Amino acid sequence: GKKSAWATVISALATVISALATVISAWATVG
Amino acid sequence: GKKSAWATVISALATVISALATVISAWATVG
Amino acid sequence: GKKSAWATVISALATVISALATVISAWATVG
Amino acid sequence: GKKSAWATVISALATVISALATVISAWATVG
Amino acid sequence: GKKSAWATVISALATVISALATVISAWATVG
Amino acid sequence: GKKSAWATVISALATVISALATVISAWATVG
Amino acid sequence: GKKSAWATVISALATVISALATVISAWATVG
Amino acid sequence: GKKSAWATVISALATVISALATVISAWATVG
Numbered sequence: 001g002k003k004s005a006w007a008t009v010i011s012a013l014a015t016v017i018s019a020l021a022t023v024i025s026a027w028a029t030v031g
Numbered sequence: 032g033k034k035s036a037w038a039t040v041i042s043a044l045a046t047v048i049s050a051l052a053t054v055i056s057a058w059a060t061v062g
Numbered sequence: 063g064k065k066s067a068w069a070t071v072i073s074a075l076a077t078v079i080s081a082l083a084t085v086i087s088a089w090a091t092v093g
Numbered sequence: 094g095k096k097s098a099w100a101t102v103i104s105a106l107a108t109v110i111s112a113l114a115t116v117i118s119a120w121a122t123v124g
Numbered sequence: 125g126k127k128s129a130w131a132t133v134i135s136a137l138a139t140v141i142s143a144l145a146t147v148i149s150a151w152a153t154v155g
Numbered sequence: 156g157k158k159s160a161w162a163t164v165i166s167a168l169a170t171v172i173s174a175l176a177t178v179i180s181a182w183a184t185v186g
Numbered sequence: 187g188k189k190s191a192w193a194t195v196i197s198a199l200a201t202v203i204s205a206l207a208t209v210i211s212a213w214a215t216v217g
Numbered sequence: 218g219k220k221s222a223w224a225t226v227i228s229a230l231a232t233v234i235s236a237l238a239t240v241i242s243a244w245a246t247v248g
Contacts, residue, residue, distance in 0.1 A: 003121035004060035004066055007114050011053035011073060014111035018049050018080055021104040022042035025087060028096040029035035034090035035097055038083050042104055045080035049111055052073040056118060059065040063122065067154045070118040070163060074147035077115045077170060080108040081143040084177060085136035087101040091094075091184060092129040098185040101132065105178035108139060112174040115146060116167035122153065123160045125184075127245040128190055132180040135197055135238040139173040142204055142231035145224050146170045149163040149211060152220035153156065158214040159221055166207040166228060173200035173235055176193050180242060183189035190246035197239035204235050208228035215221035 001060060003117055004056055007069065007073065007118040007121060008053055008056040008060050010110060010114040010117060011049055011056050014076065014107055014114055015046055015049040015053055017110050018042055018046040018107040021100065021107045022039055022046055024103050025035055025039040025042050025100040028100040029039055031096045034086055034093055038087040038090060038100065038104065041079060041083035041086060045076055045083050045107065048072065048076040048079055052069065052076045055072050056069040059069040066118065066122040070115065070122045071150040071154055073115040073118045074150045074167065077108065077111040078140065078143035078147045080111045081140035084101065084104040084108045085133065085140045087097065087104045088133040088136045088181060091097045091101045092133050102178065102181040102185050105181045109171065109174035109178045112171035116171045119150065119164040119167045123164055127248045128180065128184045131193065131238065131242040131245040132177065132184045134241050135177040135180045135193065138231055138235040138238045139170065139177045141227060141234050142170040142173045145227040145231055146163065146166040148220055148227060149159065149166045149224040152224060153159040153163045162207065162211040162214040162224065165203065165210050166224065169200055169203040169207045169231065172196060172203055176196035176200050179189055179196060180193040183193060186189055190242055194239055194242040194246055197235055197242050201232055201235040201239055204228055204232040208225055208232055211221055211225040211228050215218060215225050
């Protein structure tokens with residue numbers, strides 16, 4: 001249970017960081 | 032260039048799957 | 063248990079896609 | 094370039110955080 | 125430098141291949 | 156099944172450590 | 187520098203865990 | 218079974234590539 005809760009929090013963090021990586025990668029593509 | 036454009040697309044796909052992983056991990060957390 | 067296993071599969075999929083994005087981004091960095 | 098290198102760093106961060114979520118989910122799967 | 129950038133590319137390749145092994149192992153775990 | 160789950164845990168550990176190496180290598184590339 | 191030295195150490199650790207993962211995955215493959 | 222066999226092969230490949238990444242990272246550290 002607690003391990004799945006931590007996995008959930010970290011997956012949400014990964015989702016945010018992956019979105020940021022996507023935006024910076026688009027910036028590099030046109031920059 | 033094209034490599035950065037591919038990295039952008041695949042990062043976005045990673046973001047999509049990570050958001051789904053977050054939801055399924057929350058589902059596992061509640062049982 | 064089965065729900066946690068499915069969450070693991072989907073999280074691992076997100077990880078592999080993010081890693082592919084990373085290798086392509088690094089290849090662009092050296093390219 | 095510098096922008097592509099930064100994109101690589103942030104994408105690699107997303108990959109490590111997603112991998113952490115994956116290892117924690119697998120550990121939850123085994124108990 | 126160029127050597128550090130190449131090291132990043134090869135390390136990212138190792139990470140993607142390891143992630144592929146992980147996703148295939150998790151998929152085997154669920155069936 | 157249980158053996159495959161343990162194999163998944165150890166593979167995911169390898170993946171997270173390799174990803175950490177990748178992010179540090181990329182950070183050196185921009186550093 | 188120190189960042190590349192850390193990347194070297196952690197890549198070696200990733201190699202160690204990946205070899206163990208290979209052995210445990212073969213163990214799972216045979217049952 | 219077959220999935221675990223593929224995971225074993227890919228883990229061995231990841232082990233080799235991670236070792237190569239370690240060597241190139243050491244080369245960057247002293248190079």
